[PDB]
Amino acid sequence: FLNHCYVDTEVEMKEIYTSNHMWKLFENFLVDSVLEKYVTEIVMSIVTTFLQTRQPVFVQLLQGVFRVYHCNWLMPSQKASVESCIR
DSSP: OTTGGGSSTTOSOOSHHHHHTTTHHHHHTSOOOHHHHHHHHHHHOOOOOOOTTHHHHHHHHHTTSSSSSOSTTHHHHHHHHHHHHHO
16 A cells, blocks of 8 residues: 555655654564565655664564575665665
């Protein structure tokens, strides 16, 4: 839904995106192809001007090995995580 609403997430006027943003990110990191979907959502979401959520993205790096899921996507996720850490 929200990944499909990423085309709606690139609107010119972002008014409810500032309030709902910073709330739906941490709920997405509650438990974690599901991992791939989570990675895509994480990639879509940049850090707003307001972090401590970077420890669960390393769970994606820690869960990148020791699993049948490959790291082409995992590598992209790691890069995204690095960018988030920089931000």
